[PDB]
């Protein structure tokens, strides 16, 4: 049902996808340890933001590790190339977590934006329904990434509609709550928004490879496209969200944040 199952892979393509995925686990899980140790320097009101990154980290990494083992389970070197065996590989598992890490990333965004109470809950609900819409329509579309390209685009189209609306909610909330943010992070939060827009656009592009490059190299380009999109939407966005939390913590009087920031 997926383009990965259509081709045999050179040893170079197979080894490179395996190393991509394994490199991914390493980063997600090495970042994991960073978000853990620095959480003590984050004020109570922001510490959930760092913790959500830990959840994102382990959510992504467990998936990535699962994909790497499934990659090696599904193919074997036969007659000079890596060929599909009795198990299959697919990316659909990667949408399911997206269902999960995105609430979390939106939520740590909203926390450092100093949203609170009912506006936090009402904003989070709308975002999660809209991010969820993007993901699930997108997921139905790549189900047809072999059998029905026309239904690829239409679902991709529907998902893309959801995408635009979420980034409208996210954008509106950043620029209206820019003013509440402490220690100069009002300048920082706008870079975050643009960082997010870059790596979140990488995924549709990845989604569309079967339509414009339906061959084994396009299978590689996806997994490459996925790796950058993830490193940036999870790991780098995490780190940036964390610097904001610590900086606002220091500006709010949290002495462990003032000391950690001063230590460097
Ligand atoms: C792991 C974290 C994040 C933020 C991943 C996000 C994924 C997307 C923004 C992908 C969206 C899609 C679009 C807009 C249209 C086709 C279907 C996709 C799911 C690939
Ligand atoms: C900031 C995002 C970081 C992404 C790091 C991804 C690592 C990949 C680096 C470049 C790969 C270039 C090597 C070419 C692959 C050879 C493909 C083949 O064997 O046919
Ligand atoms: C298993 C994969 C092989 C590579 C091993 C993992 C290497 C991890 C590489 C560097 C991690 C960089 C992520 C940032 C760590 C937090 C500290 C910081 O940069 O602020
Ligand atoms: C692998 C790592 C084992 C150590 C776990 C990290 C120690 C956290 C220190 C702390 O903040 O309490
Ligand atoms: C929420 C879902 C809203 C409507 C999505 C319907 C539009 C796409 C339908 C595609 C079905 C098909 O191609 O056969
Ligand atoms: C070339 C490599 C590009 C850099 C790789 C990713 C860099 C890490 C982002 C961490 C920066 C977050 C702190 C912001 C600094 C500040 O605003 O003062
Ligand atoms: Cl506090
Ligand atoms: Cl994830």
Automatic annotation (TrEMBL):
InterPro entries assigned to the protein according to its UniProt record, in alphabetical order: Arc/bac/fun_rhodopsins (IPR001425)
Source organism superkingdom: Bacteria
GO cellular component, as recorded: membrane
Topology relative to the membrane: Multi-pass membrane protein
Subcellular localization: Membrane
Chain segments annotated as transmembrane: 19-38, 50-72, 92-113, 120-140, 152-171, 192-212, 224-246
Full protein name: Chloride pumping rhodopsin
Gene: ClR
């Amino acid at each position: 049902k997926n383009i990965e199952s259509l081709f045999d892979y050179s040893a170079g393509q197979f080894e490179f996808i395996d190393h991509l995925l394994t490199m991914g686990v390493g980063v997600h899980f090495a970042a994991l340890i960073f978000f853990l140790v620095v959480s003590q320097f984050v004020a109570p009101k922001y510490r959930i933001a760092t913790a959500l990154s830990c959840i994102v980290m382990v959510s992504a990494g467990l998936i990535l590790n699962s994909q790497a083992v499934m990659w090696t389970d599904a193919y074997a070197y036969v007659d000079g190339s890596y060929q599909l065996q009795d198990l299959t590989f697919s990316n659909g598992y990667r949408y399911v977590n997206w269902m999960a890490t995105i609430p979390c990333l939106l939520l740590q965004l909203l926390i450092v934006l100093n949203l609170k109470g009912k506006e936090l809950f009402s904003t989070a609900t709308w975002l999660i329904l809209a991010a969820w819409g993007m993901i699930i329509t997108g997921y139905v579309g790549q189900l047809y990434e072999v059998d029905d390209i026309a239904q690829l685009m239409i679902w991709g189209a529907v998902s893309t509609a959801f995408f635009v609306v979420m980034n409208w909610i996210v954008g509106t909330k950043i620029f209206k709550n820019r003013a509440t943010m402490l220690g100069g992070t009002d300048s920082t939060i706008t870079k975050v928004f643009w960082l997010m827009m870059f790596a979140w656009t990488l995924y549709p592009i990845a989604y569309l490879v079967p339509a414009f490059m339906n061959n084994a190299d396009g299978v590689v380009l996806r997994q490459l496209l996925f790796t950058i999109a993830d490193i940036s939407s999870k790991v780098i966005y995490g780190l940036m969200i964390t610097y904001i939390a610590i900086q606002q913590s220091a500006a709010a009087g949290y002495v462990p944040a003032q000391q950690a920031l001063g230590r460097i």
